[PDB]
Design a protein around this ligand. Structure first.
Ligand SMILES: CCCCCCCCCCCCCCCCCC(=O)OC[C@H](COP(=O)([O-])OCC(O)COP(=O)([O-])OC[C@@H](COC(=O)CCCCCCCCCCCCCCCCC)OC(=O)CCCCCCCCCCCCCCCCC)OC(=O)CCCCCCCCCCCCCCCCC
Ligand SMILES: CC(C)=CCC/C(C)=C/CC/C(C)=C/CC/C(C)=C/CC/C(C)=C/CC/C(C)=C/CC/C(C)=C/CC/C(C)=C/CC/C(C)=C/CC1=C(C)C(=O)c2ccccc2C1=O
Ligand SMILES: CC(C)=CCC/C(C)=C/CC/C(C)=C/CC/C(C)=C/CC/C(C)=C\CC/C(C)=C/CC/C(C)=C/CC/C(C)=C/CC/C(C)=C/CC1=C(C)C(=O)c2ccccc2C1=O
Ligand SMILES: CC(C)=CCC/C(C)=C\CC/C(C)=C/CC/C(C)=C/CC/C(C)=C/CC/C(C)=C/CC/C(C)=C/CC/C(C)=C/CC/C(C)=C\CC1=C(C)C(=O)c2ccccc2C1=O
Ligand SMILES: CCCCCCCCCCCCCCCC(=O)O[C@H](COC(=O)CCCCCCC[C@@H](C)CCCCCCCCC)COP(=O)(O)O[C@H]1[C@H](O)[C@H](O)[C@H](O)[C@@H](O)[C@@H]1O
Ligand SMILES: CCCCCCCCCCCCCCCC(=O)O[C@H](COC(=O)CCCCCCC[C@@H](C)CCCCCCCCC)COP(=O)(O)O[C@H]1[C@H](O)[C@H](O)[C@H](O)[C@@H](O)[C@@H]1O
Ligand SMILES: CCCCCCCCCCCCCCCC(=O)O[C@H](COC(=O)CCCCCCC[C@@H](C)CCCCCCCCC)COP(=O)(O)O[C@H]1[C@H](O)[C@H](O)[C@H](O)[C@@H](O)[C@@H]1O
Ligand SMILES: CCCCCCCC/C=C\CCCCCCCC(=O)OC[C@H](COP(=O)(O)OCCN)OC(=O)CCCCCCCCCCCCCCC
Ligand code: HEM
Ligand code: HEM
Ligand SMILES: CCCCCCCCCCCCCCCC(=O)OC[C@H](C)OC(=O)CCCCCCCC[C@@H](C)CCCCCCCC
Ligand code: FES
Ligand code: FES
Lengths: 535, 382, 382, 53, 53
């Protein structure tokens, strides 16, 4: 009697505790059903998969520089001195059932985590979800992005590899020693000595499996709690206002679709871990200061920092008996990048004057200057990433390596400007298109007038039509406009039988008019609620 | 406007759901089932579709279990029967797992989009500026806690608590971080000129005056005799060889005392050097640095491999251009001239090792680098 | 019974605190200040007392800082000037830190107990069985979510989702734990009788038929020649020596190839053995096990050190009692008889190594243990 | 020495004595025989992240 | 957290060659070596591990 068991368990729960009101509030919480609001969930799900795979990895990983000869199964690396970290990474890859798959899905989850964090940041920035109520949310999310970047750095640096080791040597060691007053001291504190200090990988292992994941988990908890209680913002729409949330309740629909989305994201990541090879360390010999490779790139989320290193033009200053190497330039650049990213909402409000409580998102077209600035920043980030990749770009796409370096150097001040101008004008022209639709109706096929030979596109008005043909223009309300009669009530009733065979006409008619009734009922309910809010 | 003391008994499920929405500030508008018409076969087809997706997920999960437990996993040497099975083993694990969970997710999404009823529930958002009753009551509670405590009236306690907390925090933070803090300039590495700091000294620093440091070539032999003495004739015009600072005392790796000295030589960050043979025809284009004019032994030039910018090895030697390129950040150093950077982030030349030949003709270092060899840092160029 | 729309403006702090308590179900009774009478010098003394405690905390925190920054820390070898300072270095760190924070805590407690007003606030506890409105509305919401979803009507979906989730769960859990699972009976250790399991084989198992396994004494020499061949004359009546299975091929630790075989010998769980010289007077009290009657060489008996119960070494030896005691759980084995347990948790006798002397008189195992030597397990005694 | 002796007693002997799966649990925890080269890394993971989490 | 910043979990054998004289040249695991390093060659490390225990 599962129904009786459920009832008895509910009564016992509500007697021991009293979660009825709280649970009802959680279940009844309404979440907007916009697709772009799942971008953060992608990052959350990738993070969960990262935790689950990282536990498995830590069950088999040994962090240490203790030198050992492999003497494993992988023949191409036998008798070669390597760190125990590399040896156990190879053991995970080869000598544990499914360890290669687990580590590959872990790395793919890391890449998807960074990518989805970037996409979510783009969504919120361009939609203006950081304004008065949620600047703190933006700030903690920026800290979260920085932590994710650096944890991925430490994660692919954990198995001491040739690629990851040379990346560490460059970024960490060089840029740390570069810092003027405390650079060498920071280097010695972090590595416990010179660069190959025998505590580096244990320290990174701790930072990567316990410390940084703990901070990220706490910050994700704060992030999700803030989103939960500062009810999720929404785009302007029929019944959507600054003081309501139009969407679906948590329990019946949102919970089911979020769980299913998590399942599908897990499936995508597992499929990638299977079919796509990620970081094949066995091809990469154990780290040695002398051995190198041509590629020498970090993961894509640090590729922009590496590209900054490459592109910045070797400007070194030599104060009285001292040196200020080119690494400090990039250190300051990264500092500026993070500072501006964290402080943008406050910069935005200082610049514009907006101190209003904003609960309705802005369309990126509707906010041109911010959209232009975001496009400019994305262009700069892409230029830096492809500059880091300039080695492989030059190799495959036959471009001189010097040519790619200087393309990056010039474009990091030219391409941002071009993209800013283009994005600003593009946003304004999207606004112009929206107003054209508002004032003339949707466009359709052309018709030749009866008496004379005029051609008229035979538009379709979206609002009340004047006594004559031309309609009364509507007022823009911040919501997208249907520019195709495709997406309106036109040409949308295929035979509802099946792909290969029809259904009885009675069934088809019943279904089609039932759907018509349901959709017009939804439209009428939204219209009535909209009229009720002010009217 | 009443809590429904006894009407809940006869209130139906729909009425109770509406009441809950009302209490929570949620008004459910157009909660309509997906299949109002009963008995239609489109409903059965959609049912079968979601069932097929869920069953595909289950079959793929069973496939994951069967392949995981029973498949030719385990590395297979090159060109051996079973290599193909091993190579597509992990792909099969990932394919089965991902397909299973993806199909389950697709089935769940289809159930939500086809069977779970459609709603446009609208929740009243009470964001911002809690009602004045709550605000003023919280303010009163906090202010009463602060003032009643009699703080901001015991000046001695106010200052003493601040001093105590500040001193304790100072002591605790300093004791937390002093374990990590180390002096980079503590003289530790022994040298002919007494113990010196690590950054100044590399494997090429003479431990005692007049020590012989051979430019030993690092044969890839796994462990035994990894470094072997080197001769100028071994290199030929337009050739580069990575050499290391090997000492007679640092004999082959057969012993346990050795194979730690050799491991230290191999793992020395500032140890590896590139010995390049400048072509005799191109020897006339060489421009030499101050104090490094006699460093080259005839047409042999020894430059540190560590890039002068962030310290990656600069191994990519290009002959017929005499350019030592670094792969980490694409910086070229003109080997013909003193190895000065002529492109890329680097701004300082690579340190040039003084080389010569000892008795028996083996290549040895004729001294130490006249400058620190790794990447630059604050305490440099003086 | 009204929310005080505009009365809050003139409501005082006490009234607002009472209102908040009322809203939260909290009635603050007897919230009285500690010092109603003003100007008294007992108040000043108590103020100064809490101030003194906080100032002691601050002074001790500064002491922690100064001691940590400037104290003769670092190990001092022994009987060395500075050894006394080092010995109380860490105690001083802990003393200063603990005293500082303890004094801060004492000051805070005294401030609470002497200056913060005393209250006996009583909160209304609404525990158990949320009101029927909430219970029934939650039940209605959950039941509407379940039934409206149309589940428990699509038997094909109900069963397919269960099958899919179960199959995926089982694929995933098996694929998680399967990496860890290893057959303890995979024949891996080579032996004269082919590869055998690790539990069956020890360091005393002859790798090839007729192999010589000397009972090498483990000298404490740090690294070089750790194991040295042994002779019966070395022990004297009532003597115990820990010996290991040393092969001629496992030469001294000078080489890198050696010092790994030797490390394996030292770290072998089942390798160490105790060689006991039974006193000739007491040799007549010896009882011998089935198949172990000729194992002893004259008055030499070689018993495994690993205790038969949980595998700790049984290293303690009592002569004139001939009792091999295990420190882990106080089990004694009668060495006179076959090393059968005559006390403690152990129930199986220690395995007896056959021993003899080869040419030159060096002690060598005359075979292998006729039983598994470590602690017992399921697959044993057959 | 002390703590490793404690491990050898409890974690190894007790685990390996369990009738049906004792040796199987022992080998799966220790990655093989008792002194398996992964015991301390596994305990480190368990002790800094997994169990404290 | 402080201890993890200095601890190295591994059975990889190493000769101490540290500061504690009574254990010099003795084969030990990296775990033991770094625990000794915390005790001796890290300022306040002995105190931190002792207060941890
Ligand atoms: C970690 C990462 C993973 C993800 C985790 C993050 C998830 C966050 C989502 C939040 C959801 C939530 O908390 O809902 C709970 C929610 C609590 O809030 P509520 O009920 O709406 O109360 C009124 C409002 O909270 C009153 O609030 P308001 O609407 O007036 O606005 C005030 C708001 C102001 O807004 C904020 O500032 C909120 C943001 C908080 C900042 C950071 C806090 C979170 C840090 C998390 C760190 C994690 C590590 O302050 C808060 O409410 C803060 C609440 C903090 C909870 C955060 C939870 C995490 O209700 C429940 O408790 C329902 C669950 C009932 C549980 C019992 C079930 C049966 C019992 C069985 C026990 C054993 C059975 C054996 C028999
Ligand atoms: C710092 C910086 C950006 C310097 C400049 C270097 C650079 C990126 C130059 C452009 C590269 C191109 C597009 C070369 C083709 C020749 C060329 C320049 C034609 C004119 C360009 C132009 C305006 C054309 C008009 C039409 C048009 C837009 C054509 C674009 C054609 C292309 C290539 C579109 C895709 C863009 C693309 C993928 C560029 C390469 C970028 C990267 C990082 C690829 C990474 C990558 C590589 C490198 C693999 O080898 C690989 C092997 C197996 C699986 C996966 C991959 C993989 O993902
Ligand atoms: C103008 C205007 C109106 C401004 C608005 C005012 C404003 C700023 C309002 C917001 C207020 C803010 C930001 C408050 C603080 C929020 C905060 C920190 C809350 C606590 C968060 C929390 C719970 C835990 C802490 C998490 C955490 C680590 C947060 C900080 C994240 C950041 C900024 C990390 C930066 C890291 C970084 C690069 C530091 C520079 C130090 C250097 C140069 C180290 C050397 C170095 C290393 C070590 C590398 O690894 C590396 C790798 C690749 C390339 C280069 C380098 C490199 O140079
Ligand atoms: C060889 C080898 C070892 C292979 C294995 C690889 C490995 C090591 C690890 C991965 C293996 C595993 C365990 C994979 C499965 C992972 C997993 C649990 C998937 C669940 C997805 C699934 C099976 C769905 C079935 C379809 C279905 C009926 C769905 C409806 C019922 C379900 C499952 C609902 C789940 C809801 C859900 C995702 C809850 C997450 C809980 C968390 C952390 C946060 C909740 C939460 C969410 C989700 C928000 O979006 C949100 C947005 C704004 C503000 C706040 C929140 C918020 O608090
Ligand atoms: C407000 C606090 C005021 C105090 C300022 C403290 C900074 C001045 C240091 C004074 C001590 C220096 C002289 C004597 C000591 C000396 O010569 O040591 C030096 C290194 O100084 C040390 O000791 C440790 C330095 C202390 C860490 C300080 C942390 C930063 C502070 C300033 C921030 C927290 C304070 C609160 C403000 C923030 C509030 C929060 C908002 C070099 O070490 P070395 O010779 O290589 O030996 C190594 C051994 O030190 C090493 O501990 C050992 O572990 C080895 O690794 C070893 O090699
Ligand atoms: C419901 C699931 C039904 C499936 C039952 C699974 C148990 C039967 C195993 C069938 C495979 C055995 C024959 C082929 C395979 C074989 O001979 O391998 C053996 C070991 O079997 C393995 O493979 C891994 C065993 C699988 C783990 C199963 C986990 C427990 C399950 C039963 C509980 C989860 C199921 C869901 C129910 C719970 C729901 C939650 C409420 C011995 O390994 P060995 O010869 O030493 O080599 C080592 C390599 O295995 C090793 O992976 C490698 O990593 C090395 O370390 C290597 O040395
Ligand atoms: C994380 C790991 C989790 C575990 C997952 C993996 C577990 C897989 C276990 C199944 C694998 C196969 C078992 C292998 C090993 C095995 O178990 O032995 C068998 C035993 O079957 C029998 O007859 C026993 C029944 C007869 C006696 C009746 C006894 C009743 C007892 C059990 C009642 C007490 C229970 C109290 C519980 C107390 C709990 C304490 C908390 C017979 O030997 P056999 O299968 O031929 O294996 C040969 C080796 O015996 C051979 O020494 C070797 O040389 C090889 O040849 C090998 O192949
Ligand atoms: C990849 C790209 C790089 C990354 C880009 C992200 C960084 C943030 C982006 C842009 C910031 C600069 C915006 C442009 C600032 C406008 C200047 C001005 O002249 O002020 C006029 C305003 C309107 O006044 P109005 O009554 O609307 O009348 C209309 C009058 N014509 O005045 C004000 O309130 C504001 C006065 C001063 C505001 C200070 C803002 C900057 C604060 C420092 C933060 C760092 C800045 C980094 C810059 C890159
Ligand atoms: C670990 C990284 C992150 C996780 C797990 C995460 C998760 C989420 C989720 C699930 C949401 C609600 C759904 C949505 O709005 O799409 C959200 C909202 C938000 N995120 Fe994040 N996000 C992350 C990174 C970031 C970054 C890099 C920023 C900058 C940021 C700022 C915000 C803001 C301002 C919101 C509020 C948007 C709203 O109210 O609708 N987050 N986050
Ligand atoms: C939170 C975000 C995380 C990110 C972005 C991340 C990223 C990464 C990446 C990219 C790798 C490289 C994998 C490879 O090269 O095969 C890695 C390795 C590793 N990760 Fe993480 N990780 C995260 C969380 C975790 C957690 C929570 C744990 C522990 C529970 C963990 C444990 C490990 C281990 C042990 C390794 C080394 C395994 C190996 O070398 O193959 N990671 N990490
Ligand atoms: C990372 C931040 C980088 C901060 C650099 C701090 C430089 C301190 C030492 C400068 C110096 O005087 O050394 C001698 C100099 C090299 O030679 C000359 O006297 C003529 C040089 C003409 C070029 C001047 C360009 C100055 C630009 C910077 C002020 C802008 C920094 C932002
Ligand atoms: S690391 Fe060599 S040029 Fe930058
Ligand atoms: S360990 Fe020997 S008696 Fe228990």
């Amino acid at each position: 009697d599962f129904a009786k068991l459920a009832a008895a368990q509910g009564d016992a729960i509500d007697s021991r505790y009293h979660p009825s009101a709280a649970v009802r509030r959680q279940l009844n919480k309404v979440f907007p059903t916009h697709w772009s609001f799942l971008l953060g969930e992608i990052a959350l799900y990738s993070f969960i998969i990262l935790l689950l795979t990282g536990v498995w990895l830590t069950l088999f990983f040994d962090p240490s520089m203790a030198h050992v000869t492999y003497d494993g199964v992988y023949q191409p690396l036998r008798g070669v001195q390597m760190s125990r970290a590399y040896e156990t990474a190879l053991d995970i890859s080869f000598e544990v059932r499914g360890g290669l798959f687990v580590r590959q899905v872990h790395h793919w989850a890391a890449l998807m985590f960074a990518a989805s964090i970037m996409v979510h940041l783009a969504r919120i920035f361009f939609t203006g979800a950081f304004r008065r109520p949620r600047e703190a949310n933006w700030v903690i999310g920026s800290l979260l992005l920085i932590l994710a970047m650096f944890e991925g750095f430490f994660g692919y640096s954990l198995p001491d590899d040739l690629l990851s080791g040379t990346g560490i040597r460059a970024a960490l060691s060089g840029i740390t020693m570069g810092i003027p007053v405390i650079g060498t001291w920071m280097h010695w504190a972090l590595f416990g000595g010179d660069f190959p200090g025998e505590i580096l990988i244990p320290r990174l292992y701790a930072l990567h499996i316990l410390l940084i994941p703990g901070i990220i988990l706490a910050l994700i908890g704060a992030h999700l709690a803030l989103v939960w209680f500062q009810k999720h913002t929404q785009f302007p729409g029929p019944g959507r206002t600054e003081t309501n949330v139009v969407g679906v309740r948590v329990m019946p629909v949102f919970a089911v679709k979020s769980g299913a989305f998590f399942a599908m994201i897990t499936g995508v990541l597992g499929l990638m871990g299977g079919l796509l090879t990620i970081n094949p360390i066995w091809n990469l010999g154990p780290y040695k200061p002398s051995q190198v490779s041509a590629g020498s790139q970090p993961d894509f989320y640090m590729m922009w920092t590496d590209g900054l290193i490459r592109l910045w033009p070797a400007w070194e200053f030599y104060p009285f008996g001292h040196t200020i190497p080119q690494g400090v330039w990039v250190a300051v650049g990264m500092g500026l990048v993070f500072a501006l990213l964290i402080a943008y909402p406050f910069i935005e409000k200082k610049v514009t004057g907006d101190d209003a409580h904003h609960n309705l998102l802005q369309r990126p077209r509707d906010v041109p200057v911010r959209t232009a600035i975001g496009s400019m920043a994305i262009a700069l980030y892409l230029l830096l990433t492809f500059a880091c990749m300039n080695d492989i770009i030059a190799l495959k796409f036959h471009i001189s390596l010097n040519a790619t370096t200087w393309i990056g150097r010039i474009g990091m001040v030219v391409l941002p400007a071009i993209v800013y101008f283009v994005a600003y004008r593009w946003a304004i022209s999207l606004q112009r298109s929206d107003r054209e639709v508002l004032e003339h109706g949707v466009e359709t096929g052309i018709i030749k007038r009866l008496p004379h030979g005029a051609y008229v596109e035979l538009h379709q008005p979206l609002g009340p039509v004047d006594e004559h043909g031309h309609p009364i223009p509507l007022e823009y309300a911040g919501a997208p406009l249907p520019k195709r009669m495709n997406k309106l009530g036109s040409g949308g009733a295929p035979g509802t039988g099946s792909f290969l065979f029809p259904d009885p006409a009675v069934e088809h008619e019943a279904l089609t008019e039932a759907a018509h009734a349901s959709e017009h009922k939804s439209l009428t309910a939204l219209k009535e609620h909209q009229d009720r809010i002010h009217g | 406007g009443q809590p429904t003391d006894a009407e809940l008994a006869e209130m139906s499920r729909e009425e109770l759901v509406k009441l809950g929405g009302k209490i929570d500030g949620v008004e459910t508008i157009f909660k309509e089932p997906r299949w109002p018409v009963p008995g239609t076969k489109a409903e059965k087809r959609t049912e079968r579709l979601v069932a097929y997706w869920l069953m595909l997920g289950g079959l793929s999960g069973l496939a994951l279990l069967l392949v995981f437990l029973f498949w030719p996993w385990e590395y297979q040497p090159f060109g051996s029967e079973g290599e193909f099975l091993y190579s597509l083993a992990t792909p099969l694990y990932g394919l089965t797992f991902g397909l299973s969970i993806l199909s389950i997710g697709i089935g769940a999404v289809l159930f939500q989009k086809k069977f779970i009823p459609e709603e446009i529930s609208v929740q009243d958002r009470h964001d911002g500026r809690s009602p004045e009753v709550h605000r003023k009551t919280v303010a009163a509670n906090l202010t009463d806690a602060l003032e009643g405590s009699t703080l901001k009236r015991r000046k001695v306690i106010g200052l003493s608590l601040g001093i105590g907390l500040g001193a304790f925090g100072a002591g605790t933070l300093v004791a937390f971080i002093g374990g990590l803090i180390k002096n980079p300039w503590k003289p530790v590495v022994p040298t002919a000129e007494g113990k010196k700091a690590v950054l100044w000294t590399s494997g090429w620093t003479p431990r005692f005056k007049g020590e012989t440091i051979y430019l030993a070539r690092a044969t890839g032999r796994p462990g035994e005799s990894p470094f072997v003495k080197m001769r100028p004739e071994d290199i030929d015009a337009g050739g580069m060889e990575t050499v290391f600072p090997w000492r007679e005392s640092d004999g082959d790796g057969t012993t346990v005392e050795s194979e730690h000295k050799l491991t230290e030589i191999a793992m020395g960050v500032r140890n590896p050097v590139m010995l390049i043979r400048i072509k005799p025809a191109d020897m006339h284009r060489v421009i030499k640095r101050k104090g490094q004019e006699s460093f080259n032994f005839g047409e042999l030039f020894a430059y540190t491999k560590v890039c002068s910018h962030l310290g990656c090895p600069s191994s990519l030697y290009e002959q017929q251009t005499y350019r030592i390129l670094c792969p980490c950040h694409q910086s070229q150093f003109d080997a013909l001239e003193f190895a000065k950077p002529i492109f890329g982030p680097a701004a300082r030349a690579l340190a040039q090792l003084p080389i010569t030949i000892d008795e028996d003709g083996y290549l040895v270092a004729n001294g130490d680098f006249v400058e620190p060899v790794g990447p630059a840092f604050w305490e440099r160029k003086s």
